[PDB]
Symmetry: C3
Subunit: 388 residues, 3 copies
């Protein structure tokens, strides 16, 4: 890395974009003398499937059910130039519907504890809360706020003064709305993001078809000396086929659990709050995350702040005025090549250096690398104008 | 949840109360050819009890012994209108005494590693530190401060300006003192909070009585062919009785351990510091927690801040003055129906909007939802008065 | 602890020092009918060594490889009065070299996955980043800054206003440079800090020598009835000798792993960031930590802030002026025995109390313990001078 004792790097521009990521949460859960002894083995095989089945409902609850009472929104689409009408809530959202549309003989299939209706309700409650009130740390929602005022605090949390959001509100809203529209067409048109979920579904569709492809009709036709041989052979190979099936479900379940753990982590860290980690809940600095319902999983839309062009500015520890040293009240002192300004750290904002944004401590002989500039008050000009 | 693009919810009042909760920390720990073979089984049973016994002293140390050197207070009862004389330190506190007053044949009972005197010393040291100095993050106490100045920082930590404590110091102190008095009478009069500890004590009193109710006098009277039969039967049923006893102690010990883990968590999180989680160390926002000694456990008195009546105020992103946009320096802009004020976020405090509590950035054409108001300086009035 | 309702303890001076600690990270990893049955046992013994060998490279990566792309510095020695020329980068640093200079028959020794060159590169990248740019939270470096401006933020993080660093920059730099020079001579002269690493090295040097000290020459000379006896006895005792060796390596490996876990924790907590825990990454308040390469381990140089002399000042909640109560804008009000000043909390800095560093709320009848003083504005003096 390049370095210099008077060089400071400050971003001068930024963009906001919406990153879409899809995390699988749950897998389809299924169930299924010497004969009795085989029955014992069957039970153990079923137990393994049962343990998985519990885990799968285990996963669903950990990811979605982080709110205790369900909430719903009023018919508001415009939250300050921001278009939420295609993520909000069949009464499902238009985007969720895209995800839904695009993604015997002893063998039975179980229902989920949380059905599509319950999941839609939990997702709606989480989303309704995030947008209008915001969630607190501990339990429940916080207090109602318009919406830009919520974003303003998320900007402050990444070191950006609460004036950037409002000055660039039109640009931010347009970039947000554009990204949502692009996600609209992208998810439908190209099988990109919709990869992980389809893969999981295809795999057990295959596992089930394999299990199936792999007693009374024998007993009624064959005598004991032969019937027992055919029966024992069929039972053994079928138990082996089930063992293979169970093993495949267990391994895949482990991958789903790992994904569910991540989804739950993000839900509690950046959906119900804000992530401090960069490049975690989306590339760049996290501001907000809005959950969406999906087949066998959850989809997150991450709104992130990404800095752009950076410039090399000349800096100084402090400014000398009348022999006294003036230190910056909040920001740092930088030179644009002809004039000195005071700016915040994470975004170039050339404020004029005045006595109202500085404090006085020490002197010009003590401070190292101090520069000679003019730091003026807003009072004398008024005195000169008022009666002179 | 109801929502509106210009509606902000702000609390206008609050109350402070003391929540009492009781957490069990430790359980009474006890100990107890073919004959030798039974002896092996007895040893294994004793091992299980030994493992528990270690855990029980394990628990006590984790919860109470979080301070290395013992401290004591001066004879101060009044810490700024706050009455601490009935929680401070037989040299035990009057409240602790209420808790104390209200709550062979191979079988022996063990002493604790930390006796009542040692526990009283640790509790006194933790409490002495909390009240006068406050604890730091890492090791030891911080620096001596009166007391209201400690509370002031705990208020700041929940988003309330350090003026609320002082303006309402009389009301806060009265509510605190009242709560302690109520706890005084409540704990003594009604067997409510004093439930969990009594339950634990009663259970092993029963377990021990059961074990007891459930050799030489046989050998000296019966011949071998009969004596061995009676002896083997008695040993077997006694080993079974002990197995049941050990199992009961193990299960209960697990519940005690879970409770001890929670008590230790709270001790390090909200007693030696401040909890950020709402509704954890008491309902509402945590400010302080004072530990108290108790039979077989620890009692915490949590001082929490609870907001009350909320009003729906009309808000605006910024205020227009001379065509330039004025943004709030710290708080938000709200309207009470006739006038605009600037307040903090978590408590309604209608400060007059002046140039000294705002900053100027951008203009009235760019900001969305900007309102027309007057933002004035404190200088012109002085100029007009001084020489005009 | 002593206590009083109007006494506040404030530090008036400080020192900065460099604490050196050495943590071992990795251990030398090694490898090694009835005969075949013994071979099975040998394989199990080798497996245990293999598991250790994996762990040892496991440790190295966890501690050092926390940066993905390698970086190098420009030839800068002076970073603002701070001498870094003896810690920066044979192309190894002079201090690292001191550490390096001071610290068959079936038996083989394995190489590390990360060789000395790779470790030097990772260490250089971590150090290059720490000094010039500083690391961010999530991934990669942050933004380029001189260096004093980085320290200034680390001071702010411990409650000290960003003016202390600059006013005392000469004293801080001299204390830092002095400490590094002392470490220079200390590490070379006295076998103090260089204890843990030498101990680990000596122990397996001994383990290997012991293993060695503890077939065809028998078969070609002895007949079956005797040859088998000698051979079986030698194999058994050699397998026992190896079992002892493996056990010793496993136990020591556990100690190394515990140390590696700590080193990795510090690397991610206080090297790539800042520790909030006091007396963790060095005595006192942590500011910075610079890694250094070492034989079989890592060396950390911790730069810590230590407060010194404290005084007992008289304090007051607020100051009365014209019947209105004035509260401190940032700090606290203290009396030095003759005059009232406003200072920050963690360092005595007697600023003059003026209307520009206070705010007005409430009145002199409500506030408890309010004192009568003069709080003046900087305006009237200008009005009196300008035209009177
Ligand atoms: C790379 C980048 O961020 N470019 C933007 C540009 O698109 C935008 O028009 C301009 C508005 O001032 O800010 C900058
Ligand atoms: C619900 C509630 O907090 N009510 C209080 C009231 O008891 C108190 O007298 C008043 C003092 O201004 O503040 C409010
Ligand atoms: C214990 C201690 O910190 N003493 C220092 C002293 O060495 C230094 O000369 C002085 C400079 O003002 O500050 C103080
Ligand atoms: C949101 O986008 C839809 C198009 O999908 C459009 O019909 C609607 O008017 C937009 N609403 C706002 C507030 O922009
Ligand atoms: C800043 O300086 C570095 C080092 O010379 C250079 O690589 C970089 O491109 C410069 N940045 C700009 C915007 O010129
Ligand atoms: C610095 O900013 C001023 C505006 O205040 C501008 O006039 C000047 O040209 C800028 N200097 C450079 C080198 O861009
Ligand atoms: C920065 O480094 C240059 C040498 O390249 C030196 O002359 C100058 O005085 C240094 N300035 C500061 C503030 O250290
Ligand atoms: C500022 O001006 C004074 C003379 O008024 C001079 O002595 C001092 O060196 C100058 N400082 C700098 C950084 O040029
Ligand atoms: C505290 O309460 C007791 C009554 O239990 C009373 O006697 C004592 O005077 C009170 N002290 C203060 C400072 O209020
Ligand atoms: C604020 O508005 C909501 C929605 O209409 C209403 O339910 C609530 O009662 C109002 N609050 C007050 C104090 O009137
Ligand atoms: C708003 O506050 C002012 C006091 O500054 C008061 O006179 C006025 O009546 C209040 N308006 C309402 C609707 O309460
Ligand atoms: C708030 O919503 C109303 C529609 O109910 C609209 O007329 C008004 O312009 C919106 N104001 C803002 C700031 O969005
Ligand atoms: C403020 O007054 C100006 C005229 O001076 C007017 O053009 C502008 O629209 C007004 N703003 C609002 C929010 O009413
Ligand atoms: C750093 O110390 C070395 C002595 O080891 C000295 O030669 C060099 O000049 C010093 N550099 C600075 C900037 O002090
Ligand atoms: C502050 O007061 C305590 C209690 O009397 C005393 O022990 C301590 O030495 C005093 N500090 C100083 C610097 O005198
Ligand atoms: C308090 O500080 C002033 C300087 O503003 C000094 O003159 C005075 O002697 C100090 N008082 C004491 C007791 O040190
Ligand atoms: C401090 O305690 C003394 C008694 O030693 C009392 O007279 C004084 O009024 C108390 N001051 C405050 C602010 O509590
Ligand atoms: C301050 O002076 C007023 C008289 O102007 C007096 O009533 C009040 O008690 C004094 N306050 C203190 C703390 O001495």
């Amino acid at each position: 890395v390049a370095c210099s004792n008077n060089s400071i790097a400050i971003p001068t521009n930024f963009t906001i974009s919406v990153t879409t990521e899809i995390l699988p949460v749950s897998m389809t859960k299924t169930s299924v003398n010497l004969l009795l002894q085989y029955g014992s083995f069957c039970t153990q095989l079923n137990r393994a499937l049962t343990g998985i089945a519990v885990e799968q409902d285990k996963n669903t609850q950990e990811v979605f059910a982080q709110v205790k009472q369900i909430y719903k929104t009023p018919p508001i689409k415009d939250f300050g130039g921001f278009n939420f009408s295609q993520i909000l809530p069949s009464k499902r959202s238009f985007i969720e519907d895209l995800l839904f549309n695009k993604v015997f003989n002893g063998l039975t299939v179980l229902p989920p504890l949380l059905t599509d209706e319950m999941i839609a309700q939990y997702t709606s409650a989480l989303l309704a809360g995030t947008i209008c009130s915001g969630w607190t740390f501990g339990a429940g929602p916080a207090l109602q706020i318009p919406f830009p005022m919520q974003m303003a605090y998320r900007f402050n949390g990444i070191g950006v003064t609460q004036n950037v959001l409002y000055e660039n509100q039109k640009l931010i809203a347009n970039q947000f709305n554009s990204a949502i529209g692009k996600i609209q067409d992208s998810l439908s048109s190209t099988p990109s993001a919709l990869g992980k979920l389809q893969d999981v579904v295809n795999q057990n569709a295959q596992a089930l078809n394999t299990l199936v492809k792999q007693l009374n009709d024998i007993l009624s036709r064959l005598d004991k000396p032969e019937a027992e041989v055919q029966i024992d052979r069929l039972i053994t190979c079928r138990l082996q086929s089930l063992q293979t099936y169970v093993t495949q479900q267990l391994i895949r379940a482990a991958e789903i659990r790992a994904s569910a753990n991540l989804a739950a982590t993000k839900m509690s860290e950046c959906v119900l709050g804000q992530s401090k980690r960069v490049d975690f809940c989306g590339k760049g600095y996290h501001l907000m995350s809005f959950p969406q319902s999906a087949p066998h999983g959850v989809v997150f839309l991450h709104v992130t702040y990404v800095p752009a062009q950076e410039k090399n500015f000349t800096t100084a520890p402090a400014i000398c005025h009348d022999g006294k040293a003036h230190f910056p009240r909040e920001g740092v002192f930088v030179s644009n090549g002809t004039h000195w300004f005071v700016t915040q750290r994470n975004f170039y904002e050339p404020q004029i250096i005045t006595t109202d944004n500085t404090f006085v401590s020490g002197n010009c002989d003590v401070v190292i690398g101090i520069v000679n500039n003019t730091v003026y008050d807003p009072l004398q000009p008024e005195l000169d104008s008022f009666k002179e």
